[model samples]
Target chain A: HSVIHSTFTIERTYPQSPDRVFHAFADKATVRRWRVDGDGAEFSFDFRVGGGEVSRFSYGGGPEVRLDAQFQDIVPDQRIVFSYRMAIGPQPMSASLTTVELTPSGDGTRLTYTEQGAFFDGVDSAKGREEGTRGLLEALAAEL
Target chain B: HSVIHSTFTIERTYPQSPDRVFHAFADKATVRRWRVFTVAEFSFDFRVGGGEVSRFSYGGGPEVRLDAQFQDIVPDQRIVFSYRMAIGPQPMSASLTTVELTPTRLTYTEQGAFFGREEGTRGLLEALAAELQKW
Candidate 1:
């Protein structure tokens, strides 16, 4: 038997309306801006159930790595659910399921992003996942 | 005087032939395969130096990512050059000026993977620059 489980959560508040803030994810242009604004990253989205999006960002300034996700559930200005896999060329290295939820705050919006996955070979690493999710949320916050 | 310069080189040998390997960058579907394998995030690109890719690994994944190239050319089995590879979504990422393909071996050389200070943020770029070569 093997053990496989890990989870990550990132909460960010944007000083914008739910509609406006949610547009960042719904609109292709807005989503691309925040998605690939820093860290030499780029993004694309098909925006539908069963549709998918692909993003490639560099880490530690290495080869341009690829991460692909398919939209499992999407609700305008509310939530998004998706699954992803990291790959080197044609080989899959890791896989995870992610959820992004939006809530209305005082004249603004609160976004909660969470992910659960099994690392390669069924290894669980929580600290690493937390830091990575933090950086991403920070970057996303910077965009807003 | 201000000295602003950096260099990066990444090389990966695919089991496929040079032509098939070269096609990876040329064809959109092939490129999309590598793009859709991410676990956490998603992105899109649709113009010259416009499309971007971003992802997070299971480890303390590196932040700030971009993959934009200019000038992709294939000349039989001699050479393939993708002159630009932007990093961090910033205009000042890096450029992969040349990818020289030869019989049984391919050489990739890049330049301008720079940063402000060579510490925290800068160190990330330096590390990523080296990692790129492994791909």
Candidate 2:
């Protein structure tokens, strides 16, 4: 099994306070509105610190995928830390630790996210994962 | 004695029209405004099949030269060029750069061919760029 390790950071400025931005991720129902939804997806989410989330979804007729994530740390209106492992059907793919930090920037919240991941073998690639996260962030924008 | 193929695309949007952006490269005087300075040596001809050469020497380092040749030119629309940079005689990178000018944005796409060994902190890098900084 070939393992590829990589890290990426992305920043977004949303026209909302840190409180509002933080609340978007803090509430389970709000997150469900923006997170991935396709191909009759199903999920189990627990948003508290040390709680875990699991999702099974498919995109464009692709095989169902699973993401099992845990909230390792959380700070009100400031930061969040989570780690997760993803699998594509029967293939074990990649695992990552992600940190989301938020701060105030002139009438808006500046969100900085960092993801460090290890991709397993040829089934998954670091580029694909990063792009997928970018899509989610764009969806988050629409939700906001 | 080595080469690697690579490609990159850069996108930029300007409030100005495409003609203005296109002329920035078509006119030497305007291009030089963003390009060369007193510490740098530069000259480029504006025409199809024309060639350009720029050289600069850092305060305590060796001289570097960039040579370019235009392959095709279209007024206020597109340009295709190839260029290579070097430290003295060692070929560094040769790239085919394509510039497409649109109404409100411009796209620069480059297909590159890298030469020589860039291993373990030797070849071109940030320091060299800052020393020859412009645009």
Candidate 3:
């Protein structure tokens, strides 16, 4: 079996300045409130180029789902690039590279999110991940 | 416009050992022979979680900038990196590349977003083959 590759981009306009919108991601407490919602998840965020973010969770007695991410680039108020790998229990599920770009749109901010993912076996699908990402963006919007 | 996606894998078997082949990438001059970038604004750091930036152009058409960072490196065994390419202020593509080295072969795998430049990628691999021929 071969790895399944998928790429997708999502754009959202937030009614806030680029700085404010970027701050929502740069702050640990804010991100945990919006991004990590699984029960009893242990999380760490080190925000910098080459730094890492790790989150581990066990949802409803299921096996552990862990995320290990490294920040590739960070331009405050403008852009962020990160790559992450996901594992369910001891099996590797997927790996993805994501870029988030923020630009000033009138008085608001236009955010573009691009992701390229490689799915292993049948553990994950691109469609499901894109849908989940949309929900996460909405949750972030509500937090803002 | 929606972003276009592309993924490709190229495999090659060289007579050299994995360590020797990996050295061609680690050494700046060897990589320069295969990867031709105009203006020579390049920096090389062969380490895990390191970054490299370079600017080049294609026959004076437009300046292309590459911002790349190493995601994982395991000496002569494997290398993985992520990079974004742009022309002036417009973004071209973002890609993740994985290079797996065996005793006799190397696999180059890439997953990319818009503007994948498949032909250009193939050329680069061919160039690498030629570079190895002289070693």
Candidate 4:
């Protein structure tokens, strides 16, 4: 099977500090409001070292999509590192390592998110991942 | 004055052969059907050393001009041109763009220096999709 490797980064500034920006992800209620798995999906997460998150979803009666993630490191109000895999029914589609870096900028917080992923044989694509990630970041900005 | 420097490339697969895609831009009738500056006045010539021009004025606003001189043109495969844009009187940007067509895909790469332009021009290609639908 042939695989594709890709990376994308999104920089977003919010009208809040690093702590407030970090809390948007650290707080469960805030996460549930804008997470990509969408409404009616089952989401579970533990935001600690060696902890993890999982989501199970099906859109309009289609095949179920599963995402499982684990936290590798976390620094309060500063940075986060995690890795996750996406699957459809039972086929592993992609694996991604993501990093979030936060810094204080003029009266706001600047957040940079970087994702590096291995996309599987035509089942997953670099373009699709980047588009989906952009949508997710837009949703997060609205949530904030 | 501040400058925003950016460059982006677009790659796509078109079901049509290379000649078909090239014709869409080289043919004046086809170009008019999909242009983004809908309000612009257009005058274009489709060959090497030929010139292309588009000028449009907003409602009670300044007119913008996009003038280009084709440096090279080879049927069905490659195009290279240099163009400058002016908002009323001041030049906003100047760029050199290249287009390449293959059996299954087409690529457009543009490198521009801008004084009053957005950081990305992805939307231009996006608008081209609407034009392709017309084809």
Candidate 5:
């Protein structure tokens, strides 16, 4: 498959402690609520290095989409790094490396999220993915 | 920096046991001989979620830096990690790497956004082979 590599970083301020913001990813119930907009047929989250989280769902009753994410690094209340791949139906879409950094901002937390991706074929665009991630971050804020 | 996405797999067969092959990376001094050689600074922490960082150059060439984080470790079986390299101030690539070891052979796979480093990776594997000979 032909590849197009791209990278972007987005920052957000949360009205919560770094520990609390990190829990949004570590807890299954909380993550399932905001990590995606669609309902999943299969879901499992094992939050630790070497562990993986899987989400298989579809949007608007369309083709099933799946995200297979593996935890690469974790530092409590500080940073997280993971690698994941997306699949649309049976066709592979993209693979990416993601980093999340958290710092104290007064009484709340400041988060910076970075994504480095290798998009396959022409199934997806980096711009679209970044916008989707921005939505997810917003959803996370609502969840918090 | 600009990016070029890439993936590569390389395999090698040796006459040593899997444990012997795996130990080549588990020990710091041992890995440093082949991995951190001719470097300016280096540090390694071999554990799940740990990291390895190093700075080195080729001859008197540009300075290169590597940052790697361990993702998984299955003794004598597999090693998984992610790493990114940069030359001076320009970022080069970030990759997910898996090294699977059998009783007599090892398979290495990498998926990355590369700025042309496949040949350098191949050469590093060759260095690993040379280091294995000392075992």
Candidate 6:
């Protein structure tokens, strides 16, 4: 068994309030607009703590990959903690821990995110993950 | 101005020779097979020392993004590099350094990845970097 850990934080000042910014995660339409996987990406969510969000996405318009996460905790307009499992088809590949935090900025809100996981069966590859995430975030920014 | 830095590494074992493993980066066709960006995805030469690779992704995916460069290379043994990455398309971003290759176990290890950006950017880059290693 191999352990892979990662943490990422970014600050963006939006012309919106903490409530509006937090709404981005709470509102399905807003999340769908910016949080979508991609052109052919599909996702479903149970937003409350303990609820799960399942996402299916394909890169290069190829085969679909499925990801599932269960919300562990949620603090209104403040923080969220979750755990997730990802796979290609039926193969149980990896699991991750994710945390998102929100803070009020001068004019908008600041957001921070972090994730950690373990790769099983030696399936993890550098190129695959780097390339994959690059695509996802680009789209998220555009929607935001 | 805020400065944030991040590092990412991944290790994998393929039942193949080092030469074959190295091909994954050296050959374009091989990279196209798996090294794909889920958004404005495109591919380019991953040469030694210098060159840029453009790739992108969308939501519900990894958040830290980049325009990468190849810093150093030792065929079949290691590849070192740095890049400029963004979080959520904001001008706020980070600089990252990375290393990848097959180590002594005949298995691959993404031995190094580091970044510099804002504190928030750093956190996002680090989280996303960890996620990348799992793949």
Per-candidate local distance difference test: 0.52, 0.66, 0.77, 0.68, 0.76, 0.52
lDDT (Cα, 0-100) at B82 in candidate 6:
35
Lowest summed-lDDT stretch of 10 residues in model 5 chain A?
A: A35-44
Which candidate do you rate higher for DockQ, 4 or 5? 5
Clashing pairs in 5: none
- Model 3: residues with Cα > 4 Å off, grouped in runs: A38-40, B1-94, B99-107, B112-120, B127-135
Q: What TM-score fits each model?
A: 0.45, 0.49, 0.66, 0.50, 0.57, 0.45
Pitting candidate 2 against candidate 4, the one with the higher lDDT is 4
Best lDDT among the predictions, by candidate number: 3
List, residue by residue over B36-103, the lDDT tens digit for candidate 3: 33665887787754667788887877888877766556578766777777785676666788777777
| Worst ten in a row by lDDT for model 6 chain B | B108-117
Off by over 4 Å in 5: A37-40, B1-94, B97-135
Model 3, first chain, TM-score of 0.95
Model 1: docking quality category: incorrect
lDDT string for model 4 (B31-102, tens) is 877662236578888875466878887675888887775644657876656566778457565555667676
lDDT per residue as tens, model 5, A8-101? 8899999999999999988888888897544438887899865878888876889998887777567688777678777788776766788787
Between prediction 5 and prediction 6, which has the larger DockQ? 5
What tens digits encode model 6's per-residue C-alpha lDDT throughout B8-60?
44334444455655565566665555442264655466663244545466565
Which window of ten consecutive residues has the lowest lDDT sum in model 4 chain A?
A1-10
* DockQ scores of all models, one per candidate: 0.02, 0.01, 0.23, 0.01, 0.10, 0.02
Task: State each model's C-alpha RMSD to the native.
Answer: 19.3, 19.5, 5.7, 17.8, 10.6, 17.4
Tens digit of lDDT per residue, candidate 1, span A1-144? Answer: 121345566788888778877777777876666556533256777998647788887667667667776664566787766666565554344555566778889888988877655344344555676787787667667767
Candidate 6 is graded, for docking, as incorrect
Could you give candidate 4's per-residue lDDT for residues A1-144 as a string of tens digits? 334446677888888888888998888778877774454367888888546788898878998998877664466887776666677886767665566778789789988887766555566566887888788778888887
Better of 3 and 5 by TM-score: 3
In model 4, the runs with Cα more than 4 Å from the true position are A36-40, B1-135
Give me candidate 5's interface root-mean-square deviation.
7.6
